[PDB]
Amino acid sequence: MIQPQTYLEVADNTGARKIMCIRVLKGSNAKYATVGDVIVASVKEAIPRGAVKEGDVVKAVVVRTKKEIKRPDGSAIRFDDNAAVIINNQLEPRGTRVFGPVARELREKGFMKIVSLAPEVL
Amino acid sequence: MKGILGVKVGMTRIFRDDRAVPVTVILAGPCPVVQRRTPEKDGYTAVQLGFLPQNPKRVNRPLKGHFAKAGVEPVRILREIRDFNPEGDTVTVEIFKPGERVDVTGTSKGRGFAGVMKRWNFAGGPDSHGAHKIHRHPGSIGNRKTPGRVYKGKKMAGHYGAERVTVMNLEVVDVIPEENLLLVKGAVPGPNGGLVIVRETKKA
Amino acid sequence: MRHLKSGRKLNRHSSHRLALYRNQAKSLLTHGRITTTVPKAKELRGFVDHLIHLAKRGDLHARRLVLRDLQDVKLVRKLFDEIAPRYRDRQGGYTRVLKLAERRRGDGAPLALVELVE
Amino acid sequence: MNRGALIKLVESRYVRTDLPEFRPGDTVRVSYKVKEGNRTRIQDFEGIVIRIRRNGFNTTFTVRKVSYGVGVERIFPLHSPLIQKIDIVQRGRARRAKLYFIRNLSDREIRRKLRADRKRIDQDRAAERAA
Amino acid sequence: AKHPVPKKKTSKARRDARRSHHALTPPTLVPCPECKAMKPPHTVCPECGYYAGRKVLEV
Amino acid sequence: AGXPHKR
RNA sequence: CGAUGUCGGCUCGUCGCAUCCUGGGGCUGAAGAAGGUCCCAAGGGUUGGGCUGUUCGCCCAUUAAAGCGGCACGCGAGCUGGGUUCAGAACGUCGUGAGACAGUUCGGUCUCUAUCCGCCACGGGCGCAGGAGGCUUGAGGGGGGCUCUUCCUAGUACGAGAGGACCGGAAGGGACGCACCUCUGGUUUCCCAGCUGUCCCUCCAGGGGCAUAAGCUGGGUAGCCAUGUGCGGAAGGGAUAACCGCUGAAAGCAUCUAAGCGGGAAGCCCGCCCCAAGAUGAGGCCUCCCACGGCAGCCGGUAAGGACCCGGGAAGACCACCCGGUGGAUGGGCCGGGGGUGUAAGCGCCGCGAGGCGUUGAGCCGACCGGUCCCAAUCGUCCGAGGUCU
RNA sequence: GAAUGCCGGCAUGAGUAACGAUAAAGAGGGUGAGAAUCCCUCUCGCCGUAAGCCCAAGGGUUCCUACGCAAUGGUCGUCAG
Ligand SMILES: [Mg+2]
Ligand SMILES: [Mg+2]
Ligand SMILES: [Mg+2]
Ligand SMILES: [Mg+2]
Ligand SMILES: [Mg+2]
Ligand SMILES: [Mg+2]
Ligand SMILES: [Mg+2]
Ligand SMILES: [Mg+2]
Ligand SMILES: [Mg+2]
Ligand SMILES: [Mg+2]
Ligand SMILES: [Mg+2]
Ligand SMILES: [Mg+2]
Ligand SMILES: [Mg+2]
Ligand SMILES: [Mg+2]
Ligand SMILES: [Mg+2]
Ligand SMILES: [Mg+2]
Ligand SMILES: [Mg+2]
Ligand SMILES: [Mg+2]
Ligand SMILES: [Mg+2]
Ligand SMILES: [Mg+2]
Ligand SMILES: [Mg+2]
Ligand SMILES: [Mg+2]
Ligand SMILES: [Mg+2]
Ligand SMILES: [Mg+2]
Ligand SMILES: [Mg+2]
Ligand SMILES: [Mg+2]
Ligand SMILES: [Mg+2]
Ligand SMILES: [Mg+2]
Ligand SMILES: [Mg+2]
Ligand SMILES: [Mg+2]
Ligand SMILES: [Mg+2]
Ligand SMILES: [Mg+2]
Ligand SMILES: [Mg+2]
Ligand SMILES: [Mg+2]
Ligand SMILES: [Mg+2]
Ligand SMILES: [Mg+2]
Ligand SMILES: [Mg+2]
Ligand SMILES: [Mg+2]
Ligand SMILES: [Mg+2]
Ligand SMILES: [Mg+2]
Ligand SMILES: [Mg+2]
Ligand SMILES: [Mg+2]
Ligand SMILES: [Mg+2]
Ligand SMILES: [Mg+2]
Ligand SMILES: [Mg+2]
Ligand SMILES: [Mg+2]
Ligand SMILES: [Mg+2]
Ligand SMILES: [Mg+2]
Ligand SMILES: [Mg+2]
Ligand SMILES: [Mg+2]
Ligand SMILES: [Mg+2]
Ligand SMILES: [Mg+2]
Ligand SMILES: [Mg+2]
Ligand SMILES: [Mg+2]
Ligand SMILES: [Mg+2]
Ligand SMILES: [Mg+2]
Ligand SMILES: [Mg+2]
Ligand SMILES: [Mg+2]
Ligand SMILES: [Mg+2]
Ligand SMILES: [Mg+2]
Ligand SMILES: [Mg+2]
Ligand SMILES: [Mg+2]
Ligand SMILES: [Mg+2]
Ligand SMILES: [Mg+2]
Ligand SMILES: [Mg+2]
Ligand SMILES: [Mg+2]
Ligand SMILES: [Mg+2]
Ligand SMILES: [Mg+2]
Ligand SMILES: [Mg+2]
Ligand SMILES: [Mg+2]
Ligand SMILES: [Mg+2]
Ligand SMILES: [Mg+2]
Ligand SMILES: [Mg+2]
Ligand SMILES: [Mg+2]
Ligand SMILES: [Mg+2]
Ligand SMILES: [Mg+2]
Ligand SMILES: [Mg+2]
Ligand SMILES: [Mg+2]
Ligand SMILES: [Mg+2]
Ligand SMILES: [Mg+2]
Ligand SMILES: [Mg+2]
Ligand SMILES: [Mg+2]
Ligand SMILES: [Mg+2]
Ligand SMILES: [Mg+2]
Ligand SMILES: [Mg+2]
Ligand SMILES: [Mg+2]
Ligand SMILES: [Mg+2]
Ligand SMILES: [Mg+2]
Ligand SMILES: [Mg+2]
Ligand SMILES: [Mg+2]
Ligand SMILES: [Mg+2]
Ligand SMILES: [Mg+2]
Ligand SMILES: [Mg+2]
Ligand SMILES: [Mg+2]
Ligand SMILES: [Mg+2]
Ligand SMILES: [Mg+2]
Ligand SMILES: [Mg+2]
Ligand SMILES: [Mg+2]
Ligand SMILES: [Mg+2]
Ligand SMILES: [Mg+2]
Ligand SMILES: [Mg+2]
Ligand SMILES: [Mg+2]
Ligand SMILES: [Mg+2]
Ligand SMILES: [Mg+2]
Ligand SMILES: [Mg+2]
Ligand SMILES: [Mg+2]
Ligand SMILES: [Mg+2]
Ligand SMILES: [Mg+2]
Ligand SMILES: [Mg+2]
Ligand SMILES: [Mg+2]
Ligand SMILES: [Mg+2]
Ligand SMILES: [Mg+2]
Ligand SMILES: [Mg+2]
Ligand SMILES: [Mg+2]
Ligand SMILES: [Mg+2]
Ligand SMILES: [Mg+2]
Ligand SMILES: [Mg+2]
Ligand SMILES: [Mg+2]
Ligand SMILES: [Mg+2]
Ligand SMILES: [Mg+2]
Ligand SMILES: [Mg+2]
Ligand SMILES: [Mg+2]
Ligand SMILES: [Mg+2]
Ligand SMILES: [Mg+2]
Ligand SMILES: [Mg+2]
Ligand SMILES: [Mg+2]
Ligand SMILES: [Mg+2]
Ligand SMILES: [Mg+2]
Ligand SMILES: [Mg+2]
Ligand SMILES: [Mg+2]
Ligand SMILES: [Mg+2]
Ligand SMILES: [Mg+2]
Ligand SMILES: [Mg+2]
Ligand SMILES: [Mg+2]
Ligand SMILES: [Mg+2]
Ligand SMILES: [Mg+2]
Ligand SMILES: [Mg+2]
Ligand SMILES: [Mg+2]
Ligand SMILES: [Mg+2]
Ligand SMILES: [Mg+2]
Ligand SMILES: [Mg+2]
Ligand SMILES: [Mg+2]
Ligand SMILES: [Mg+2]
Ligand SMILES: [Mg+2]
Ligand SMILES: [Mg+2]
Ligand SMILES: [Mg+2]
Ligand SMILES: [Mg+2]
Ligand SMILES: [Mg+2]
Ligand SMILES: [Mg+2]
Ligand SMILES: [Mg+2]
Ligand SMILES: [Mg+2]
Ligand SMILES: [Mg+2]
Ligand SMILES: [Mg+2]
Ligand SMILES: [Mg+2]
Ligand SMILES: [Mg+2]
Ligand SMILES: [Mg+2]
Ligand SMILES: [Mg+2]
Ligand SMILES: [Mg+2]
Ligand SMILES: [Mg+2]
Ligand SMILES: [Mg+2]
Ligand SMILES: [Mg+2]
Ligand SMILES: [Mg+2]
Ligand SMILES: [Mg+2]
Ligand SMILES: [Mg+2]
Ligand SMILES: [Mg+2]
Ligand SMILES: [Mg+2]
Ligand SMILES: [Mg+2]
Ligand SMILES: [Mg+2]
Ligand SMILES: [Mg+2]
Ligand SMILES: [Mg+2]
Ligand SMILES: [Mg+2]
Ligand SMILES: [Mg+2]
Ligand SMILES: [Mg+2]
Ligand SMILES: [Mg+2]
Ligand SMILES: [Mg+2]
Ligand SMILES: [Mg+2]
Ligand SMILES: [Mg+2]
Ligand SMILES: [Mg+2]
Ligand SMILES: [Mg+2]
Ligand SMILES: [Mg+2]
Ligand SMILES: [Mg+2]
Ligand SMILES: [Mg+2]
Ligand SMILES: [Mg+2]
Ligand SMILES: [Mg+2]
Ligand SMILES: [Mg+2]
Ligand SMILES: [Mg+2]
Ligand SMILES: [Mg+2]
Ligand SMILES: [Mg+2]
Ligand SMILES: [Mg+2]
Ligand SMILES: [Mg+2]
Ligand SMILES: [Mg+2]
Ligand SMILES: [Mg+2]
Ligand SMILES: [Mg+2]
Ligand SMILES: [Mg+2]
Ligand SMILES: [Mg+2]
Ligand SMILES: [Mg+2]
Ligand SMILES: [Mg+2]
Ligand SMILES: [Mg+2]
Ligand SMILES: [Mg+2]
Ligand SMILES: [Mg+2]
Ligand SMILES: [Mg+2]
Ligand SMILES: [Mg+2]
Ligand SMILES: [Mg+2]
Ligand SMILES: [Mg+2]
Ligand SMILES: [Mg+2]
Ligand SMILES: [Mg+2]
Ligand SMILES: [Mg+2]
Ligand SMILES: [Mg+2]
Ligand SMILES: [Mg+2]
Ligand SMILES: [Mg+2]
Ligand SMILES: [Mg+2]
Ligand SMILES: [Mg+2]
Ligand SMILES: [Mg+2]
Ligand SMILES: [Mg+2]
Ligand SMILES: [Mg+2]
Ligand SMILES: [Mg+2]
Ligand SMILES: [Mg+2]
Ligand SMILES: [Mg+2]
Ligand SMILES: [Mg+2]
Ligand SMILES: [Mg+2]
Ligand SMILES: [Mg+2]
Ligand SMILES: [Mg+2]
Ligand SMILES: [Mg+2]
Ligand SMILES: [Mg+2]
Ligand SMILES: [Mg+2]
Ligand SMILES: [Mg+2]
Ligand SMILES: [Mg+2]
Ligand SMILES: [Mg+2]
Ligand SMILES: [Mg+2]
Ligand SMILES: [Mg+2]
Ligand SMILES: [Mg+2]
Ligand SMILES: [Mg+2]
Ligand SMILES: [Mg+2]
Ligand SMILES: [Zn+2]
Predict the structure, then answer these.
(1) Which single residue of A66, B88, B151, B162 has CA 20 to 30 Å from C7?
(2) d(CA D89, CA D87)
(3) How far apart, in whole angstroms, are the C-alpha atoms of residue B11 and residue B171?
(4) What is the DSSP letter of C78?
(5) Residue numbers of B between 23 and 62 with CB closer than 8 Å to D
(6) Are the beta carbons of B30 and B89 closer than 8 angstroms?
(7) Which of the following CATH numbers is that of domain C14-118: 3.40.50.1000, 3.90.1030.10, 3.40.50.300, 3.40.50.410?
(8) Breaks (C-N over 2.5 A) in chain A follow
(9) Does the nearest atom of strand G lie within 7 Å of B135's Cβ?
(10) In 3D, which of C96, C112, C95 has the Cα closest to residue C104?
(11) Boundaries of every domain in chain C
(12) In sequence order, which ranges of chain C are alpha helices (DSSP H)?
């Protein structure tokens, strides 16, 4: 449940640290973004000399949420933060690493690169 | 147009192909036929179904005479299923198989006098910024001198629920003939213990 | 909505309502029979039937439990020594409520008696 | 009729009795059958059980873990057929029935608050001496 | 608000039509099987003190 | 770098 | 002018169509794709932000689209009160001055009680020619009506290439709607535990009040719920719009038309869901009572039935509705289970002690699922047909 | 017959709003024609830098006792300033 104004950690080495969702790229008027949904974001905090810098308007895919996501098998999974991975217009990651676990929902949603770079897929 | 009377018993989930499927459990049969509606005599076609046995001590004479002509023990409720003429003289859950698709009718839970926010999902008022005793009020209800009145059907506060509701196209997940049970995926109107009607769907 | 909720409110907040029940319990267990309004009477039944049943157990844990409501040690003694023994073979139902025929004058309220059973 | 018995009757085909009893505060490894791309796998999830909400067949339990610097909580139905096995890896003694407070604690604060439930540990070791 | 107020005096006919629902229903009363007095059903008889066939209360 | 920063 | 509250916002809509999108078309300087432009179409839809009192507008990020207008520039006995529009104050400017300025600036009392119409809900009465208990037909209303992406067809037709379809077929969404509580997530005013201060019971131990209308804190059943779950828009039939025809004169040719007949829209009718015989045009079917006594009328006693009263209820403001009333499981208790809390008190043992260990998943324990006549629905009363005329 | 006329009487709104701090009550026993409301007892709750006590102002018999309840008391009243 990410929506405009929501801050997210960036789980990659793109240089970003914190992004604030400014749009949920899901149809005409999606209220929320969950795992696997792409957002548009402003970069609110970056480390010096990165691929992205503070003030960039980037796209990112939500890779884990503090709201638990439910699964057709009757189980759920929840994380301790909202994290996302900065991507390009071809849904490819813009960094070389991703940090922390990601939700397996990314695989079925079409983000095979990120899932591979993930240390754990839960 | 097969149909059967039932009582809603409660909800659960079962597992089916490593997938959790929320179900609501309905006790349907057995349902004797007590009167058949014919085009020759009644102008249409239907079966009057009985359901749930009744203590004869509390069945009055005119009803007792009705059951008698049918050859049926006294029953609690009588409901008709329209355009349905079962070959037998008793309808059970076995008229439904798993994977079929049904419409379920029940009486929704009664909320009594419901405000405009619960009944009609109105937005109410602000909760600060000067809002003055209107937090749950409906707002304007009209215009001014033209038309100088309120439309019929204007959404307002009033009784909500305890009405007939049909939810449609529910998958029949399982049927347990030994206990007249019927598992249906999803949500069925009404409280546990209420009277439901299960009919073959009208969705193609 | 009030769907499947147990418990009268009796237009008292939570600590006043518990105190109402405790004071009525003391009065019933003291006099054997008391007059109240019908709604209060109907609520007393459960509250007192539990204290009596605990008195049937008789152990020290029961006494301290019952003391939490009744507070009066002599009263509990009468409950454990005199009242509870006469119910030893009775499975619940230690209290009865019978309605009275005349209402109060000043507020028309319907009255009932609540008594301990024989 | 007894509506409650009818529901328990519906649930009886799916009730499991092979899984070990455990309590909040116990550290646990759940072997869980997942599907990834084509095939299906067994992925272990090991952590402290922070709650067990009971509803007969519909009872569920939450297991919390720190994975690569991120807290992960996972909820499992206790009678889920996707559960291959559950290995008790440690018995912890809690004083609460729900342990959400360990979300705000460091690793050494948790270790100090949830210490080994020596009693039930002895019980496990006394069993398994079944012969 | 802006203080709503009757626009016209209610007519004799109209205020009496309002009151067509105000007649009291007489108290419902059964005879007491002991003393034969008229009393409300399901109450202890206030005349002889009996209910359910036995003496319950002093009159 | 929490948590929002000032700078 | 013995008062028609004046901008904007919010809330709630509803209508028009000169149509923003979606559906159907003709022309194109239409290869395809994507456009342009005109015609038909008002069913549905028509996003979230920054600035500003703003309407408007500009901008950011999206979108199928971010339509324009009416309804007293819709809506202050619905809310707001930022602007404007009293009294205070100041700036620029004008005036000798008092003062003044659709110039600016800071501040600045928006009235508990709805009689009538109207609207949302719910009853009472009478009627529907015997009196009743059931089950129904549906005249006529109302609700609903949205849409995108990806894949297959097929990198095919078209195209130098870039690019890239029609038709047909799958899958997955967004917003909205109805219902629901198994799951996820709330609440859960006393369901359990822990805690501080104080006063008290009874000194220890154990407890009770108060600290909020829960003292505080950690939890939390049923219920009510959404963030959660199911399901819905349809399909289909029919008649049409623009538009395209078949056959065809008048008018030897031609012409969709004058006779006749096709095709053709998210739109119209039906279909789906809900209300519904006060539909006074008051419908239909099944069943029950039965022709009573006394001078289309009266008074009585009754029949079938119903009401009263009572125990209650996921029904409910009252009313109504539904269930039950001893031939009974309706509520209360009690028992069993569930569920919550998380190992009571007492005792024993270890420690100088705070405590710890065992007894012990103990004790307590709302509503949920059941059982059990232990308590209470005692006993009764009053209404209620004899059926108009051709 | 009108002057938002004057004085008085009586209507309507209506058995409606309200009955004046949300500190809170319950039972038993008295009294009496009559009692939720007066007296007594027990239980409960509220104030306690007061919601307790003592002066001053102002008020002017409101103090105490007996006997009463038409009106006054926002209900009742056997009680009371
Ligand atoms: Mg990093
Ligand atoms: Mg840099
Ligand atoms: Mg910066
Ligand atoms: Mg990256
Ligand atoms: Mg990290
Ligand atoms: Mg990997
Ligand atoms: Mg199955
Ligand atoms: Mg029934
Ligand atoms: Mg129902
Ligand atoms: Mg029904
Ligand atoms: Mg209902
Ligand atoms: Mg209700
Ligand atoms: Mg409301
Ligand atoms: Mg709502
Ligand atoms: Mg609702
Ligand atoms: Mg609603
Ligand atoms: Mg709102
Ligand atoms: Mg709100
Ligand atoms: Mg508020
Ligand atoms: Mg105000
Ligand atoms: Mg105000
Ligand atoms: Mg107001
Ligand atoms: Mg307010
Ligand atoms: Mg007006
Ligand atoms: Mg106006
Ligand atoms: Mg008009
Ligand atoms: Mg209703
Ligand atoms: Mg409905
Ligand atoms: Mg489907
Ligand atoms: Mg069965
Ligand atoms: Mg019901
Ligand atoms: Mg509510
Ligand atoms: Mg409420
Ligand atoms: Mg109940
Ligand atoms: Mg109740
Ligand atoms: Mg209570
Ligand atoms: Mg109250
Ligand atoms: Mg009150
Ligand atoms: Mg009170
Ligand atoms: Mg009251
Ligand atoms: Mg309190
Ligand atoms: Mg006492
Ligand atoms: Mg006595
Ligand atoms: Mg009394
Ligand atoms: Mg009382
Ligand atoms: Mg109890
Ligand atoms: Mg009685
Ligand atoms: Mg009475
Ligand atoms: Mg009185
Ligand atoms: Mg009174
Ligand atoms: Mg159940
Ligand atoms: Mg793995
Ligand atoms: Mg850890
Ligand atoms: Mg500790
Ligand atoms: Mg410790
Ligand atoms: Mg231990
Ligand atoms: Mg107002
Ligand atoms: Mg006001
Ligand atoms: Mg007013
Ligand atoms: Mg007038
Ligand atoms: Mg009037
Ligand atoms: Mg008059
Ligand atoms: Mg008159
Ligand atoms: Mg008159
Ligand atoms: Mg009237
Ligand atoms: Mg009235
Ligand atoms: Mg009446
Ligand atoms: Mg004027
Ligand atoms: Mg005037
Ligand atoms: Mg005027
Ligand atoms: Mg006026
Ligand atoms: Mg047009
Ligand atoms: Mg279009
Ligand atoms: Mg088009
Ligand atoms: Mg040309
Ligand atoms: Mg084209
Ligand atoms: Mg075109
Ligand atoms: Mg339209
Ligand atoms: Mg429109
Ligand atoms: Mg703005
Ligand atoms: Mg800002
Ligand atoms: Mg402008
Ligand atoms: Mg487009
Ligand atoms: Mg906008
Ligand atoms: Mg406009
Ligand atoms: Mg105009
Ligand atoms: Mg408009
Ligand atoms: Mg104008
Ligand atoms: Mg203007
Ligand atoms: Mg206006
Ligand atoms: Mg206005
Ligand atoms: Mg106003
Ligand atoms: Mg305004
Ligand atoms: Mg107005
Ligand atoms: Mg108004
Ligand atoms: Mg309003
Ligand atoms: Mg202001
Ligand atoms: Mg202002
Ligand atoms: Mg301005
Ligand atoms: Mg101003
Ligand atoms: Mg100057
Ligand atoms: Mg000058
Ligand atoms: Mg000059
Ligand atoms: Mg000025
Ligand atoms: Mg001016
Ligand atoms: Mg001006
Ligand atoms: Mg200017
Ligand atoms: Mg200025
Ligand atoms: Mg100020
Ligand atoms: Mg009115
Ligand atoms: Mg009002
Ligand atoms: Mg009028
Ligand atoms: Mg009626
Ligand atoms: Mg009849
Ligand atoms: Mg009938
Ligand atoms: Mg019908
Ligand atoms: Mg119709
Ligand atoms: Mg009509
Ligand atoms: Mg229609
Ligand atoms: Mg449509
Ligand atoms: Mg291809
Ligand atoms: Mg190509
Ligand atoms: Mg081809
Ligand atoms: Mg080519
Ligand atoms: Mg297609
Ligand atoms: Mg809509
Ligand atoms: Mg709804
Ligand atoms: Mg529900
Ligand atoms: Mg609901
Ligand atoms: Mg729940
Ligand atoms: Mg539940
Ligand atoms: Mg929960
Ligand atoms: Mg839940
Ligand atoms: Mg709950
Ligand atoms: Mg308690
Ligand atoms: Mg303790
Ligand atoms: Mg201290
Ligand atoms: Mg204490
Ligand atoms: Mg003492
Ligand atoms: Mg002590
Ligand atoms: Mg105290
Ligand atoms: Mg205090
Ligand atoms: Mg207090
Ligand atoms: Mg506080
Ligand atoms: Mg406490
Ligand atoms: Mg709490
Ligand atoms: Mg909670
Ligand atoms: Mg939702
Ligand atoms: Mg859908
Ligand atoms: Mg041609
Ligand atoms: Mg031709
Ligand atoms: Mg020709
Ligand atoms: Mg023609
Ligand atoms: Mg045609
Ligand atoms: Mg053709
Ligand atoms: Mg056609
Ligand atoms: Mg469509
Ligand atoms: Mg109907
Ligand atoms: Mg009729
Ligand atoms: Mg009907
Ligand atoms: Mg008509
Ligand atoms: Mg007529
Ligand atoms: Mg007729
Ligand atoms: Mg009829
Ligand atoms: Mg017919
Ligand atoms: Mg009731
Ligand atoms: Mg009743
Ligand atoms: Mg009622
Ligand atoms: Mg009825
Ligand atoms: Mg009935
Ligand atoms: Mg009955
Ligand atoms: Mg009966
Ligand atoms: Mg009876
Ligand atoms: Mg009966
Ligand atoms: Mg029962
Ligand atoms: Mg029972
Ligand atoms: Mg009850
Ligand atoms: Mg249990
Ligand atoms: Mg348990
Ligand atoms: Mg211990
Ligand atoms: Mg112990
Ligand atoms: Mg020692
Ligand atoms: Mg337990
Ligand atoms: Mg207990
Ligand atoms: Mg139990
Ligand atoms: Mg349940
Ligand atoms: Mg029995
Ligand atoms: Mg009798
Ligand atoms: Mg005169
Ligand atoms: Mg004159
Ligand atoms: Mg005059
Ligand atoms: Mg005047
Ligand atoms: Mg006037
Ligand atoms: Mg004058
Ligand atoms: Mg005058
Ligand atoms: Mg005068
Ligand atoms: Mg006068
Ligand atoms: Mg005079
Ligand atoms: Mg006068
Ligand atoms: Mg007068
Ligand atoms: Mg008057
Ligand atoms: Mg009057
Ligand atoms: Mg009234
Ligand atoms: Mg009254
Ligand atoms: Mg009124
Ligand atoms: Mg008032
Ligand atoms: Mg009132
Ligand atoms: Mg007041
Ligand atoms: Mg008061
Ligand atoms: Mg008062
Ligand atoms: Mg106060
Ligand atoms: Mg207060
Ligand atoms: Mg206080
Ligand atoms: Mg008491
Ligand atoms: Mg009292
Ligand atoms: Mg008293
Ligand atoms: Mg007395
Ligand atoms: Mg009194
Ligand atoms: Mg008294
Ligand atoms: Mg008093
Ligand atoms: Mg006294
Ligand atoms: Mg002090
Ligand atoms: Mg103090
Ligand atoms: Mg004076
Ligand atoms: Mg007096
Ligand atoms: Mg008096
Ligand atoms: Mg008097
Ligand atoms: Mg005198
Ligand atoms: Mg007075
Ligand atoms: Mg008086
Ligand atoms: Mg007064
Ligand atoms: Mg006297
Ligand atoms: Mg005195
Ligand atoms: Zn008698």
Answers:
(1) B162
(2) 6
(3) 15
(4) I
(5) 23, 25, 27
(6) no
(7) 3.90.1030.10
(8) none
(9) no
(10) C112
(11) 14-118
(12) 14-31, 38-57, 60-70, 73-77
CA angle at residue D59 from B6 to A76, to 5 degrees?
105
- How close B151 gets to chain A, by Cα (Å)? 31
Q: Cα separation of A106 and A34, whole Å? A: 10
Single-letter residue type at A2: I
Q: Give one DSSP letter per residue of chain D, joined into a string.
A: --HHHHHHHHHGGG----SPP--TT-EEEEEEEEE-SSSEEEEEEEEEEEEEE--GGG-EEEEEEEETTEEEEEEEETT-TTEEEEEEEE-EE-SSS--GGGGGS-HHHHHHHSEE-HHHHHHHHHTT---
The tokens of B168 are what?
């449609």
Amino acid present at B129: H
Contact: chain A with chain D (3+ CB pairs below 8 Å): yes
Number of Cβ within 10 Å of residue A28's Cβ equals: 4
d(CA B159, CA B115): 9
Buried-state track A48-76, b at ≥16 Cβ within 10 A, e below 16:
eebbbebebebbbbbbbbeebbebebbbb
At E54, is the secondary structure helix, strand, or coil?
A: strand
The span from the CA of D105 to the CA of D90, in Å, is 19
* First vs last C-alpha separation in chain C: 40
Environment class of D7 (CB within 10 Å of its CB; exposed 0-12, middle 13-18, buried 19+):
buried
Task: Give the Cα separation of D105 and C94 in Å (integer).
Answer: 52
Alpha-carbon torsion B137, B138, B140, B142, what sign?
negative
* B4, burial (CB in 10 Å: exposed 0-12, middle 13-18, buried 19+): buried
**Residue keyed to tokens 């009167």:** B35
Instruction: Tell if the CB–CB gap between D7 and B176 is shorter than 8 Å.
Output: no
